[PDB]
Amino acid sequence: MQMAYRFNGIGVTQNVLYENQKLIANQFNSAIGKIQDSLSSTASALGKLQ
């Protein structure tokens, strides 16, 4: 319901979430899982702190 209220915030109706919840969860899990590979391979992202 929190994600449905975020989609209603960005102008998309709630049935888009409630009929694609598994696909949205899988896309989010893949997007989080790419970040670990990017941080483990490329160490030049933290140039500001360096």
Added chain:
Amino acid sequence: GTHWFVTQRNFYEPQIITTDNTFVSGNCDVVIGIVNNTVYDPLQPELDS
């Protein structure tokens, strides 16, 4: 506890779930966590006139 209403998000003000404050989309099997309750039609007492 027994009956289902619809409120606004930031203040508890329950109202009877009709066809005016709800919209119809899809069917039952796709939404996860759906429940069963009657949705009142305001046209029915005018049909009983």
